């Protein structure tokens, strides 16, 4: 089955990070101070849809209005299974039109069936026409006692300011690389699945903030790696080659050593690594170096296995020099498209390096 | 019942698919691990196996034999997928049916269980074309479909899809097909079709394909026509505007010698022979590459160049590394901006001109 | 909810907005009453709360007064929500003409409970072409017992032929203090702990809107488990920073490496499209550069950001500015080709902070 779906948190306990959101809602529920319009924003997969659902689920828990919904009363279990008569989840991206919104409006006045509240969770809410936005206005400003509105969207940017002044806005923050990792561990553990430590460090980086993105990558990682989430498997799928070879090329280049450079390229070519990619790990490395030079506490956590060496580079090579290599490889990337041959193109770009090399240029006639 | 090879030869079993072995692996692997997703996005450049594979992944999910990685192709199900006649791979031409109302219909008819098949499999192809709104429409469903539903997403340009869409898929970038990969195939196909071929001619086609199996089969079919039945080194090379080695180098040379009258007149002679201009530039770009390469280590000049080697080595000895880089770039750029200039010829002539006057430093 | 409970029932309870109240106060007082009034301005500054008030004052049992009592059957009936002769149409949900025509068939019949049949059409910019026409025909021959109250955020959308039939009051957005003093009052009343500088922070963050304000405050209370503390308020508002783009420009000029590496990292959390960050900065430098060519190039727009912008123009060499721009404008053209997009902005800002292009 599908990890992305199977692990959608079922209680606040199970929500990753977002303390600033969970912490308000719980504080507010137990405080009896509850709004009628809650808005949820953040980039894909950081938990908004699932948080919102937890809120509904906690608003209607037969045990009482609690931030710790019980997950066993008819109301909680039936919210879990998405078949709870009083949590009306509207796919705002298909109920976008006014007439559609008016229908949601008309059927508001009527009291809930089995719950303390009729809670409308309007997901992907940025899609509503202008028309159906203002439609929502007054009814969102002053609803009936038993009505609550859970809105949620990727970009709140699109909602009219009139809508905004009427809600609590909770902005879920994207996830730390650490956070993602820890979850990926827990889940692969719970799901009983072999995993190399570093393969997780790699996925959580590639997730670029999104706990779903990560679970989506893991899902296909598991398949790519054959029931194992192995480093080789993750870096295969990712276009990454495991870090040494990349740097070794930088080094050889700053060291003006041509033989080594071309050899190292030849060896990468034996591994049939895809050329643009290579270029990019090199720009990646140069950049982190040039950064390390700015703030020292700047060097990444993930590249311990190479920190010794990186640090050295940042220490020994002139900034104005790295600005050279970076730019040179960068317009090198700009070129690869049209170069005769993507290998040739990378090679040629490093040959360009060598000839303009700041410290030991190539020999002239 | 004739269909272009590029059509007739569409891989019908996972066995008959070229390269992309990482994709097929993960796939057959998942089916066999019972780890089947609901949203498969397939990406890569033109004609490398995107939609072909998607359709094969469909077969496997639906096969009368079971859910398999290795779909037979001999059941009412597989045969109907091969022919499109299969009721339960709703295959959408995204680039044609892009509007929301269009894809909201799609959504309404999802909830409904499949006809004579096991899974209802949508295959939105050319998907980068769905309106902004159409993407968002799918978000809620694509993330949480019905157990009996499977979404198959293929496109050339995944850049365009919303990251919200991407967050909800397994993505499989297909790699471009290796030159060899394309040739071995090409060979095979012409064999089975009972067409005569010369190996070096195959070599030229695989190159000109520029990564792409469809491109290849299309030039192949083109070959066969202008060849009168045969795919000959002669015919293919004349077709692709292929160079006789001398000509390129001579230019490269007349260019660094700063010899205007001769660069220009050399082109004039090329234009007469009807050379593919983009070809010339690439070959010079190729020559400029060795030259800069030989400067690095003398050994770097291949066994291939024996005929030239003499002229190559001089160019390498005389002209500064530095200065060659200029030459190479000026030509690359000119290849880039080639189709945009008034004639292709002119594009070349202007490129040589710009590069011409590099010669004396100060 | 704070926003709901603290809706002003007496004119006295209303914050600022005096140029509106007074003229109403006085027109009521001095027997001048137009058949129809239009209330505009920005989200949550009084528009409808005042519109309701004008109804109270129009029908008060004590007579047509500027100072409605808020204790008669009428004032509490309106305050409650169900007053026979207070017809408040949600123009935004009922905009088609069918519904406007049916609303105005009943306009003619005499008012059951009180002095005037008061129609309060709120969010009125939504009514169709045709629906406006209907209204119009009624505004051009207004029954005596009837008064119309139009409230909208966006007035420009009403036809000239209707704005030419209403006395229009543009409500001003609220002042930083105006909001703060109101925030103190309300928290005070509700019995809730607050700090001085916590509220100063919310009033600022409201960006002129008293609703934004209490909506922000409500949230703030939850972050604070019952206390509105600076410690908590500042954290929360940090959850919702637009900042980044300007904020980086600032730490850019000063040449603060950590502040930059940190903002870039804060922006990461907000979850930003990076190309868009550069563009906001670039835009930001543009504006500034031109505030350097007139005080006049700063928007009615700006305001919230504006203080920071002007200082920045004052204290950076115009030649330094065109420079920063170059560096950014460049880094943008390079963004696709930089390894990461993040990386490309980071690199651009280093370039801008510390380096100089020689050419």
């Amino acid at each position: 089955q599908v990890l992305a779906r199977k692990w959608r948190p079922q209680t606040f306990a199970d929500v990753v990070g977002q303390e600033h959101v969970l912490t308000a809602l719980a504080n507010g529920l137990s405080l009896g101070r509850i709004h009628h319009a809650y808005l949820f924003s953040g980039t894909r997969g950081v938990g908004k849809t699932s948080i919102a659902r937890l809120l509904a689920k906690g608003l209607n828990c037969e045990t009482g209005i609690t931030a710790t919904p019980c997950g066993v009363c008819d109301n909680c279990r039936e919210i879990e299974q998405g078949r709870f008569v009083d949590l009306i989840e509207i796919d705002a991206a298909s109920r976008t039109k006014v007439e559609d919104t008016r229908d949601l409006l008309d059927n508001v006045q009527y009291a809930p069936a089995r719950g303390r509240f009729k809670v409308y969770l309007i997901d992907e809410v940025h899609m509503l026409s202008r028309h159906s936005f203002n439609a929502l206005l007054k009814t969102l400003e002053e609803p009936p006692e038993h009505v609550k509105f859970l809105l949620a969207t990727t970009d709140p940017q699109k909602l009219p300011v009139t809508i905004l002044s009427r809600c609590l806005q909770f902005h879920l923050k994207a996830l730390d690389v650490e956070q993602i990792r820890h979850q990926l561990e827990h889940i692969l553990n719970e799901e009983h699945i072999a995993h190399e430590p570093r393969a997780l460090q790699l996925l959580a980086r590639a997730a670029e903030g999104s706990l779903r993105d990560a679970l989506s990558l893991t899902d296909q990682a598991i398949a790519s790696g054959d029931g194992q989430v192995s480093t080789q498997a993750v870096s295969a799928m990712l276009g990454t080659l495991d870090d040494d070879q990349a740097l070794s090329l930088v080094e050889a280049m700053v060291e003006a050593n041509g033989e080594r450079v071309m050899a190292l390229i030849n060896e990468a070519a034996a591994r049939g690594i895809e050329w643009e990619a290579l270029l990019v790990e090199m720009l990646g490395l140069l950049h982190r170096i040039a950064m390390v030079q700015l703030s020292p506490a700047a060097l990444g956590n993930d590249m311990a296995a190479i920190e010794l060496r990186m640090r050295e580079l940042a220490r020994t090579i002139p900034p104005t020099d790295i600005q050279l290599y970076y730019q040179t490889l960068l317009i090198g990337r700009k070129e690869l498209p049209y170069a005769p041959d993507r290998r040739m193109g990378v090679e040629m770009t490093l040959l360009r390096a060598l000839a303009f090399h700041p410290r030991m240029p190539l020999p002239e006639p | 019942s004739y269909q272009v090879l590029a059509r007739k030869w569409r891989p019908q079993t996972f066995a008959d698919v070229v390269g992309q072995e990482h994709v097929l692996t993960a796939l057959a692997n998942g089916l066999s691990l019972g780890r089947i997703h609901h949203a498969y996005l397939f990406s890569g450049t033109r004609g490398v196996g995107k939609t072909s594979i998607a359709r094969l992944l469909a077969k496997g999910l639906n096969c009368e034999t079971g859910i398999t990685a290795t779909p037979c192709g001999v059941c009412d199900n597989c045969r109907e997928i091969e022919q499109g006649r299969f009721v339960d791979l709703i295959e959408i031409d995204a680039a044609s049916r892009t509007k929301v109302e269009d894809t909201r219909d799609l959504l309404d008819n999802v909830q409904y269980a499949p006809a004579r098949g096991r899974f209802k499999v949508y295959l939105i192809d050319e998907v980068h074309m769905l309106s902004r709104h159409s993407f968002n429409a799918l978000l809620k469903t694509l993330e949480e479909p019905p157990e009996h539903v499977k979404f198959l997403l293929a496109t050339t340009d995944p850049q365009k899809l919303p990251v919200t869409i991407l967050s909800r898929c397994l993505q499989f970038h297909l790699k471009a097909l290796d030159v060899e990969q394309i040739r071995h195939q090409l060979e095979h196909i012409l064999n089975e079709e009972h067409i005569a071929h010369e190996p070096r001619a195959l070599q030229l086609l695989a190159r000109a394909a520029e990564g792409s199996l469809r491109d290849a089969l299309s030039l192949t079919d083109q070959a066969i026509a202008s060849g009168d039945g045969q795919v000959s080194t002669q015919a293919v090379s004349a077709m692709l505007g292929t160079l006789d080695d001398d000509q390129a180098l001579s230019l490269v040379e007349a260019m660094v010698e700063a010899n205007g009258e001769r660069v220009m007149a050399l082109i004039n002679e090329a234009a007469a022979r009807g050379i593919e201009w983009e070809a010339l530039l690439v070959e010079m770009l190729g020559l400029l590459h060795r030259i800069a390469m030989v400067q690095l280590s003398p050994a770097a000049l291949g066994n291939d160049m024996a005929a030239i080697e003499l002229r190559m080595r001089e160019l390498a000895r005389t002209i500064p590394p530095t200065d060659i880089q200029l030459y190479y770039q000026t030509l690359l750029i000119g290849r880039k901006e080639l189709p945009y200039a008034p004639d292709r010829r002119m594009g070349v002539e202007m490129t040589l001109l710009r590069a011409l006057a590099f010669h004396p430093r100060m | 909810v704070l926003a709901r409970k603290w809706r002003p029932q007496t004119f006295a309870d209303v914050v600022g907005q005096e140029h509106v109240l007074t003229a109403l106060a006085n027109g009521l007082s001095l027997g001048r009453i137009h058949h129809a009034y239009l209330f505009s301005g920005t989200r949550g500054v009084g528009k409808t709360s005042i519109a309701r008030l004008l109804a109270k004052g129009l029908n008060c049992e004590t007579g047509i007064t500027a100072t409605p009592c808020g204790v008669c059957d009428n004032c509490r009936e309106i305050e409650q929500g169900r007053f026979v002769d207070l017809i408040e149409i949600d123009a935004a949900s009922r905009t088609k003409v069918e519904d406007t025509r049916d609303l105005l068939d009943n306009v003619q019949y005499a008012p059951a409970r009180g002095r005037f049949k008061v129609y309060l059409i709120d969010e009125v910019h939504m009514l169709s072409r045709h629906s406006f026409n209907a209204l119009l025909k009624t505004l051009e021959e207004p029954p005596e017992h009837v008064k119309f109250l139009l409230a909208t955020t966006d007035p420009q959308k009403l036809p000239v032929t209707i704005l030419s039939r209403c006395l229009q009051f543009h409500l001003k957005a609220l002042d930083v203090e105006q909001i703060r003093h109101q925030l103190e009052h309300i928290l005070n009343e509700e019995h809730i702990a607050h700090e001085p500088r916590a509220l100063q922070l919310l009033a600022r963050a409201a960006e002129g809107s008293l609703r934004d304000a209490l909506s922000l405050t409500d949230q703030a209370i939850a972050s604070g488990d019952g206390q509105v503390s600076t410690q908590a308020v500042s954290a929360m508002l940090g959850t919702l920073d637009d900042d980044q783009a300007l904020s980086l420009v600032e730490a850019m000029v000063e040449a603060n490496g950590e502040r930059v590496m940190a903002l870039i990292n804060e922006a990461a959390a907000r979850g930003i499209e990076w190309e868009a960050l550069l563009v906001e900065m670039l835009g930001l430098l543009h504006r500034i550069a031109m505030v350097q060519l007139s005080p006049a190039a700063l928007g009615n727009d700006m305001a919230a950001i504006e203080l920071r912008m002007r200082e920045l123009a004052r204290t950076i060499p115009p030649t330094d500015i065109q420079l920063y721009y170059q560096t950014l404008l460049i880094g943008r053209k390079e963004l696709p080709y930089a390894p990461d997009r993040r990386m490309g902005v980071e690199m651009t800002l280093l370039r801008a902070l510390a380096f100089h292009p020689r050419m």
Binding site: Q293, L294, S295, P296, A297, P319, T320, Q323, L324, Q327, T328, I331, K334, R352, F356, P361 | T322, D323, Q325, L326, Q329, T330, R361, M362 | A255, N256, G257, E258, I330, R351, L353, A354, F355, H356, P357, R358, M359
Partner: peptide, 27 residues
């Protein structure tokens, strides 16, 4: 303006160079 510095121009490779080392080195 070196001949190299000139070639870099022709190549689009923009040369960057310090200007405020102060906020670099020092953390």
């Amino acid at each position: 303006t070196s001949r190299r510095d000139w070639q870099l121009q022709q190549l689009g490779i923009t040369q960057w160079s310090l200007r405020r080392p102060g906020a670099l080195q020092g953390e």
